[PDB]
Design a protein around this ligand. Sequence first.
Ligand SMILES: CCCCCCCCCCCCCCCCCC(=O)OC[C@H](COP(=O)([O-])OC[C@H](O)COP(=O)([O-])OC[C@H](COC(=O)CCCCCCCCCCCCCCCCC)OC(=O)CCCCCCCCCCCCCCCCC)OC(=O)CCCCCCCCCCCCCCCCC
Ligand SMILES: CCCCCCCCCCCCCCCCCC(=O)OC[C@H](COP(=O)(O)OCCN)OC(=O)CCCCCCCCCCCCCCCCC
Lengths: 70, 171
Amino acid sequence: MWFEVLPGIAVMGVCLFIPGMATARIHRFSNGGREKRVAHYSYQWYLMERDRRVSGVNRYYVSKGLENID
Amino acid sequence: PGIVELPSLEDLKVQEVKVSSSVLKAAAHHYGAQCDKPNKEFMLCRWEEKDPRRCLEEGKLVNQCALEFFRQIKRHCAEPFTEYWTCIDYSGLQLFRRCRKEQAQFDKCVLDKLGWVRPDLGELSKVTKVKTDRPLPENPYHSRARPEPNPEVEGDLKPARHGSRLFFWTM
Ligand SMILES: CCCCCCCCCCCCCCCCCC(=O)OC[C@H](COP(=O)([O-])OC[C@H](O)COP(=O)([O-])OC[C@H](COC(=O)CCCCCCCCCCCCCCCCC)OC(=O)CCCCCCCCCCCCCCCCC)OC(=O)CCCCCCCCCCCCCCCCC
Ligand SMILES: CCCCCCCCCCCCCCCCCC(=O)OC[C@H](COP(=O)(O)OCCN)OC(=O)CCCCCCCCCCCCCCCCC
């Protein structure tokens, strides 16, 4: 009956679920377990490049806190 | 023209605030509260001199007062601050609004152990006044002497001497 349309809808739903979950896991993987930094504005880009400099390992996502200062 | 004068590399050595942008953003309100005076002396010197070479030492005072700002966090409230800037650091836009309970723990421990009150909505954007001893720059643009203006019109307006003087027209 009407539940015969649900396997195709479920397959199409998995195909629509793959890009979002994929880009979420890839952005968590490539950014040190966290969200990708959003730099729409030049202040955000300046802070992100300053993070890349102060990390010392050429990665913006490697965070340095109070342990880095004496 | 001339040689542009630059300070030496020893004149630029200061101990850097080597912390991340989420670390700076986490403590930024208490930083603007407690490190007001050297930061504003520096930014006054920076908008008035219009020259960063004349703004090194005040800048060093900024980098002197920021580090003492973080040491005073590290001696007292290292763990709630760390729990707070980690939560700031997770967000891609670095939302303050996702991190209110860690903010509350950090603000509680800072008000208890250091007595610092966090600035309210509208305080760190105030135009404040700065009492320095350095003199006012009399020519910050290094402008030379302006050309003298043309002489203005004076004297009462007389009629035209014998009119237009155009070939034979007597008026
Ligand atoms: C107390 C308060 C009250 C007091 C009241 C006192 C007055 C009471 C009376 C009231 C009426 C006053 C009339 C005006 C003042 C006198 C004007 C005068 O005689 O000027 C002499 C003027 C120069 O003589 P002046 O000895 O040096 O001056 C004596 C005065 O002191 C003249 O004064 P100025 O020395 O200061 O002159 C200034 C200067 C003197 O001029 C100059 O310095 C040289 C430059 C002049 C222009 C040259 C242009 C040339 C190329 C174009 C030619 C066009 C074609 C010719 C005309 C074809 C037909 C239109 O004028 C100009 O440059 C302006 C241009 C000329 C205008 C003249 C007046 C025209 C009014 C009537 C128009 C009708 C047609 C007239 C002829 C048009 C052609 C001019 O003569 C000419 O230039 C030759 C033209 C003839 C003069 C016009 C006479 C006006 C009356 C005409 C009646 C008949 C009409 C017939 C039907 C229409 C024609 C088909
Ligand atoms: C994001 C999600 C995307 C999902 C996409 C896919 C959705 C559909 C998934 C498959 C659904 C079941 C398909 C079954 C097909 C029929 C199988 C079968 O029994 O075929 C029989 C045929 C002949 O058999 P025979 O041995 O000759 O029989 C004589 C018996 N005495 O034997 C044959 O024809 C040979 C065997 C053919 C098997 C084909 C199976 C389907 C292949 C589809 C390609 C995509 C598969 C999934 C990819 C993603 C996952 C890895």
